[PDB]
Amino acid sequence: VDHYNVAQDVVQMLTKYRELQDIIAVLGIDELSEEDKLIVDRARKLVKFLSQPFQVAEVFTGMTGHYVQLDDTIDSFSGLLMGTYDQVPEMAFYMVGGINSVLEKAKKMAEEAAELEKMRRAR
């Protein structure tokens, strides 16, 4: 039942995202209400989060692949829909596997940007 509910919610959010795309490209992004803006952000994360690195492409693309178990998939998407991961950057979901990969890539991004600040603050 949880799998069905999550899948339907994702489909509903994606459909709403397409509708919101039409509006923002007509009236403007600022014209969306607070709820619509949150829906857009969550939907974009979902779209980025649906991409996965295949192990078959390790040689060509270099990046190590991921095999996401079903249990992880339901929890990872269920949490995103609720809004638990509303502070994670959008790009952390692009071509990553599982929720844990999202977090580790966030560490590597937050720590990476830390050096950039110390550089840009200095010099």
Binding site: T84, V88, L103, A110, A113, E117
Partner: peptide
């Protein structure tokens, strides 16, 4: 008022999520 008077895998995600966001606040500070 009475309510105030009275009072592992998922922990890793909460730990990482908290710690992940911990550096995101620190970078903003300095």
């Amino acid at each position: 008022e009475a309510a105030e008077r009275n009072p592992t895998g998922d922990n890793a995600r909460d730990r990482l999520l908290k710690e992940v966001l911990a550096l995101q606040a620190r970078i903003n500070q300095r």
